[PDB]
Amino acid sequence: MTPAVTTYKLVINGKTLKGETTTKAVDAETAEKAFKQYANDNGVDGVWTYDDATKTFTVTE
């Protein structure tokens, strides 16, 4: 079987970068690493939440 994958969302409230993006992953930790890399690649340094009910991460500066 292929692994079950989930779509995770990132809500970004940055100083210059704003909006939403998505990633697909087998688990939340994998998604978190992809989103933290995305934020670092775009110069975002903020604080984070994760809601397991909605599969949504949020970062604010």
Swiss-Prot record:
Sequence-type repeats, residues: 7-61
Subcellular location: Secreted, Cell wall
Highest taxon of source: Bacteria
Function of the molecule: Binds to the constant Fc region of IgG with high affinity.
Name of this chain's protein: Immunoglobulin G-binding protein G
Gene: spg
Shown stretch of the complete protein: 293 to 352 of 448
